[PDB]
Amino acid sequence: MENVTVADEYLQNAGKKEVEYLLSFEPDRLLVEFRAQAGLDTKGAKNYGGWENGPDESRNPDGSSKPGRFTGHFVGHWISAASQAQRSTFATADQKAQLSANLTAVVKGIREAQEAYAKKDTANAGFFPAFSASVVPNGGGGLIVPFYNLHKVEAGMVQAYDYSTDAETRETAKAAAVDFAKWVVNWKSAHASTDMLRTEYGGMNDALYQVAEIADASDKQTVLTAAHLFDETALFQKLANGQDPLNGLHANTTIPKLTGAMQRYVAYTEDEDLYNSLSADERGKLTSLYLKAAQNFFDIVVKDHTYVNGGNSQSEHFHVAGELWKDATQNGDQNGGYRNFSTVETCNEYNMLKLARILFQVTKDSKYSEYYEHTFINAIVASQNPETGMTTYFQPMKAGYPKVFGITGTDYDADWFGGAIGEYWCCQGTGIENFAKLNDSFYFTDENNVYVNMFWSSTYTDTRHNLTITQTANVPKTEDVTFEVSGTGSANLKLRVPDWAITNGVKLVVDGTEQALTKDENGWVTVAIKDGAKITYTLPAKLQAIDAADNKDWVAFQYGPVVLAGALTDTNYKTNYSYGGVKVRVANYDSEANAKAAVIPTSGSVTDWLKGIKEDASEGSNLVRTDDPNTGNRETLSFKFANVDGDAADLTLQPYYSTYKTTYAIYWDMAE
Amino acid sequence: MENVTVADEYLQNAGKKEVEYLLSFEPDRLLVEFRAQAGLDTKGAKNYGGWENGPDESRNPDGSSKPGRFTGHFVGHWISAASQAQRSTFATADQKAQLSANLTAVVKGIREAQEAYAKKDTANAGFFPAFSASVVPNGGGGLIVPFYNLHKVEAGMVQAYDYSTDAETRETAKAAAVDFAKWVVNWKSAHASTDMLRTEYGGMNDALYQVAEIADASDKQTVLTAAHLFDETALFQKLANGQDPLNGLHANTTIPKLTGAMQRYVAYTEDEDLYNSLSADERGKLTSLYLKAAQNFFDIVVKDHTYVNGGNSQSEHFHVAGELWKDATQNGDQNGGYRNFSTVETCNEYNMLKLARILFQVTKDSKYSEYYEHTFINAIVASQNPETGMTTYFQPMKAGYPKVFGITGTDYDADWFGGAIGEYWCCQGTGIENFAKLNDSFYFTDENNVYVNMFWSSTYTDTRHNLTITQTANVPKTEDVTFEVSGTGSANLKLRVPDWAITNGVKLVVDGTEQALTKDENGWVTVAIKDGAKITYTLPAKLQAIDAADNKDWVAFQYGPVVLAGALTDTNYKTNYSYGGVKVRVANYDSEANAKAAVIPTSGSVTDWLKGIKEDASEGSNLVRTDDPNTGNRETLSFKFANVDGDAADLTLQPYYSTYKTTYAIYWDMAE
Ligand SMILES: [Zn+2]
Ligand SMILES: [Zn+2]
């Protein structure tokens, strides 16, 4: 197998915690609501509760009856994450065997429930019985976003087909997935005049195109039909025209529709039979509608809707182009609900990363890699508590809030959470995938080329080209990246010249000779590689200030690919949150912390003070690097301000991604 | 502390004898050679002699100069066994305190000698001075197998660290062990071109990996370097590839090497820092080379090189696959040397049990537990004289020999052995450990599970799950095994359905209700337990004939897990042996006795007569159980042949393990 064993200690920890969390779920509990709805033996089990509550107070840990719930959505993500983990390299052999056993139990359990349900309600044969079919597609009786929830199960099944080491389990997942697609078409046929897209359906089009990719030849058209039902072509047409229609749209709702557009492109273009199936017009639309919508959506989001950490949205929605500071600061700091703190739902970056990834695969444009790296570090790796492994919902952008993480709802992390019932936010479900597949986008490989998407210490056993590539990277703690190659084959390594590097300082040495940084048409430097190749790639980290389009005086600092955060005040994870939405924990504001985020130039204006920040972070800069490059790991990166008045002078700045024990400032308030 | 108290009277006797033996050794006499070599005061002491003689005629009780010897090997075993005993439950509180004091004296004494030696020969600092460093590694001046001898001391130091109740002792042992490991590296650095693996080195890799496990972080890599130098990867590679290269290999030399391969596996997989230290290639080879070599070695030894009692080897060697009858019978019955009687060295089964144990711990496969039970009974328990507590070297498989045991070489058993000077064979060293750690493999515990490895009357205080488990077992004298559970926690009990039970008769009753014999993927039946649980497991014993692959007419009989032996003639322990190898006592043939082991069917052919053997040993069988199930202990099991001519008609068959006063037949010669 191709594999990427990850050497980085921080990432190894992050991935290990996820494997441990994943192992803590009991199949019988994950399976309860499917079995109940299918009229099968629940074996006395409770569901995991929270978003995975069902209608029934007996099966719900919290004893609640018909609560607002999203039944099946986290089980789906668990199938995805368990599939990913028992094929990645974070889990030991023993962990993988147990995780793969539990995956198998769940995949077969759902299939068994699907088959029993098909007998009980033949009209809806193929439905995944996570909840009542009667409430499709707008929800009912407390069940929210039915197709969103089902989407996770369908996508999960595809991951199980792709990655289960057990052949039976793969074939069962495929059958389950194809039969669900068939249900979608049947259902729609019997509800011809019902609209399916009004209510959030997640990436259902994406998932069904994936099923079409794995389906037997004779099923492909049926599944493509199901998939195309979930293409929101009105939205795509607007995006493909270069319009920005995002103001007021639910952000995480929208983003996966464009990944689905991209999956339609890939499904048809990778299989001549499917491509030949289309009208020459629809063949054209793959590019003019579907790919263009995704390209434009991505560009519009990054330019006009993205915060310094790669993330987007506030109160779960896109707002006016360019109005980032307003959304993050003019919406209140009261306890509870969704307010200033509700910036940058984390699911959104899972989905943005998948969109960048598939756009990279199709186009090879380096800008998607630049984004991927940035958002991976600054939103995804940043989402996780390194001690508990749990992950964030929102990522507050205004200074003075703590990071708030979910809880397990299992016996995992009992030392932290006791016997608390889990909540299972959407964001925890995309969360478990983030860490199960943490190493899935280090490299991309086609016929001749190995693209280095990110700079991390790892070993890639490139089975396509018969090469082992070992990268040593610690950017931006130290500046030199090395690659050593062994094997029998040959390839071109492709390197990005990061925009976060000091361009003049960038140096490429290949087998002891310097090489020019000549970019291909997609932005990549090419290095021929074979057994014995040795590369030193020097990437001096640039320190930069980054403001908001709508406020020059709201400023974050980034060193290399790492956004910095100031540690403001202590926080207590037991009490530092309230609730909003459906059982979503939200950060409590620390006004005393916020005030410390005043940056007040001693001498000169704000403008002058910003000009005095040196790219090299050296003495004389108004923000100086204080850590010793040759002592401590990457997380010991440290900066301090200079020529500032107030508490700011005393603050240390450190990586945002590793900041969790304290309230923090990522954006600072420049004070003239 | 977890503990297992053994109620079985035979095993209680066996363990108590060992404790008594261990206590008869004086630390000053164990330390003599280490002190002498280090230039320390020997206090006028003589060493114990035999294999524990040194070069010097004045310290050897026998007055020999530079005899064939193995100085340190038995001291090391004694350190192991004293450590095991003073942490087991066979010894009284007084016996534990005394033995612990004596362990302390010996560990500090060796550490003292190690530190003194390091000043006198700074090149070889860390060497354990059992003998001259200059004869490392091939031996010289009468000192044989240097690294094998030092292996025992190293492994000893680990046991002391594991089990000593004195913290100074634990720390002294760890220091000694780690410094020995550093010495291995230094010595090899200074003798880079010397091959270290050609002469038997015992399980040096195993012990050094164990030392890597207990070592301070900053020392682990140095110790792992030492351990891996004793990894005989050429042998492992052949076994991993599924070849049988065993013919002509010394068996006890070979077996512990594979235990070492497993220790490599465990050392790295249980410590994330060590695991993460490995290249991706070597991470894979943990499974593809080391685990697999061990797995295949086990399978090949058991299928093609093992006698009916679980044991292997003739003349200390493996021979041709399947030629067990030939090795055991076509090599002479003359007195002295190593001939037919030299089958089944006893060390070998100590080592096989340890390999099986660690394979079980990693894989949980029930076949390792099946083998463990079989060989623990039929080769290990069978190796001891229940009156003297002394143990066997060889175990003759050809009929007509007596069991020959060692002597104490101490004041222990002086009524039997007088003032005779000890021999301290290998098999006596493993033997003292066998009986010291006699309760160490009744159960295996992991997070949710308690595996019943063997069926013995005991009480297990399971401190991991807060349960006390009282097992009552007498198999195969009576068929019912009962478990009673008390406490406050919960676990799953895991039970084997033994292949030696009559399948159809196996019955499981849990808290009054029969439960099915559903096996997990590893072969185990699962029983939820907690306070007040009561289990009756009915295991009706199967009687069976077991031949040799190379001779259908060379046949042994087994009832449940107990191999039977016929009592043939009286034997006199004072005169019934000669010598072979280095001071090894070997059994003298009784040709009369052998002739009684002729089995001639009255009516029918051999084939017919073997078919007439009933699984239940009932009337009508050609071999019938004659003892009353409800009268006597397990050792009163008795059987007689039916429908046979000659003296065989008159013989009684009883358990092999408790046969010691007579010559015996285990394999019978079927005659048409
Ligand atoms: Zn979310
Ligand atoms: Zn031996």
Residue numbers in the entry:
A (entry chain A), B (entry chain E): 379 to 1050
Task: Give excerpts from the publication.
In the present study, we characterized a GH146 β-l-arabinofuranosidase, Bll3HypBA1 (BLLJ_1848), which was found to constitute a gene cluster with AGP-degrading enzymes. Bll3HypBA1 also exhibited < 1% degradative activity for Araf-β-pNP, Araf-β-OMe, Araf-β-Hyp glycosides, and β-AOSs containing Araf-β1,2-linkage compared with Araf-β1,3-ArafGal2 containing Araf-β1,3-linkage. The crystal structure of GH146 Bll3HypBA1 consists of three domains: catalytic (α/α)6 barrel (aa: 379–820), β-sandwich 1 (aa: 821–920), and β-sandwich 2 (aa: 921–1051).
Since the region following residue 1052 in the NΔ379CΔ761 structure was disordered, we also crystallized the Bll3HypBA1-NΔ379CΔ933 (aa: 380–1051) construct. The crystal structure of NΔ379CΔ933 was determined at a resolution of 1.70 Å. The Zn-coordination site structure of NΔ379CΔ933 was also almost identical to that of NΔ379CΔ761, but no Tris molecule was identified in the active site. The Zn atom is coordinated by E723, C725, C804, and C805 in Bll3HypBA1. F448 and I522 occupy the active site in Bll3HypBA1, whereas W162 occupies this position in BT0349. Therefore, these residues may determine the β-linkage specificity of Bll3HypBA1. In contrast, Bll3HypBA1 can act independently on rice AGP. This is consistent with the structural characteristics of Bll3HypBA1, which contains no large structural element covering the active site.
